[PDB]
Amino acid sequence: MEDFVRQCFNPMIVELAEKAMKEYGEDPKIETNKFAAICTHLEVCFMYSDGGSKHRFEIIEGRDRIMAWTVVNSICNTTGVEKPKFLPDLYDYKENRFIEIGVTRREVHIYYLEKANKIEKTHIHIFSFTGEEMATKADYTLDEESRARIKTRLFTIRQEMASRSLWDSFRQSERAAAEL
Ligand SMILES: COCCNC(=O)c1nc([C@@H]2CCCN2C(=O)COc2ccccc2)[nH]c(=O)c1O
Ligand SMILES: [Mn+2]
Ligand SMILES: [Mn+2]
């Protein structure tokens, strides 16, 4: 999986993922499913912002967690949006709401229900590796072409992993994390 990740993701994304794991005391060379999951989620967050104008989004994911909370506080202080209890992935400057992005190897609606349970003003948008998506109130934020690019990328990743016999382990690892 190490070779797959370094071959299919931008070096900057790989390095941010390595950094994140090291800060959490994890080895990218050992927890390789997590390594790929982090890369995939960060890439999706970048592709999501590309779906709006350059004025539309603040990307919160992939930044120093301590500093990210100060940006969240500045947004909440200036816009009057309620402060989220959990650090989100994006802020939408147009709709003035935070966004939580889910990327799951599980079923999109089960994942949505759990995320919603764990989260009230944050908008939730879930993507799968099988071309499915789910979003709060069926409000998908982006146009269909921007979302098609995301779904297509994730579908492509699943096929590439499957051809290297990595998909089944990657799939099961999200469920093992949920079981524990
Ligand atoms: C990880 O803790 C630092 C802040 N966590 C996030 O921001 C975040 N966490 C997760 C899931 C649920 C709780 C922990 N976790 C994972 O370890 C899965 O892998 C990821 C790790 C980081 C980013 C994306 C995926 N799911 C997301 O969608 C997400 O945005
Ligand atoms: Mn996040
Ligand atoms: Mn997320």
Numbering used by the authors: 1 to 53, 73 to 138, 141 to 201
From the study:
The influenza virus RdRp is a heterotrimer that includes the polymerase catalytic subunit (PB1), the ‘cap-binding’ subunit (PB2), and the endonuclease-containing (PA) subunit. The ‘cap-binding’ and endonuclease functionalities of RdRp work in concert to perform the essential ‘cap snatching’ of host mRNAs to generate primers for viral transcription. The essential endonuclease domain within the PA subunit is a particularly attractive drug target. The chemical scaffold for our studies is 4,5-dihydroxypyrimidine-6-carboxamide (DHPC), which was originally developed by Summa and coworkers (Merck, Italy) into the first-in-class HIV two-metal integrase inhibitor raltegravir (Isentriss)30.
Initial diamide compounds such as 6e (general structure 6: R1 = phenoxyacetyl, R2 = 2-methoxy ethylamine) showed relatively weak activity in the FP assay (Ki = 1.6 μM), but compounds such as 6f (general structure 6: R1 = 2, 6-dichlorobenzoyl, R2 = 2-phenethylamine) showed improved binding (Ki = 0.36 μM) for the amide series, although the potency was generally not as high as the corresponding carboxylate analogs.
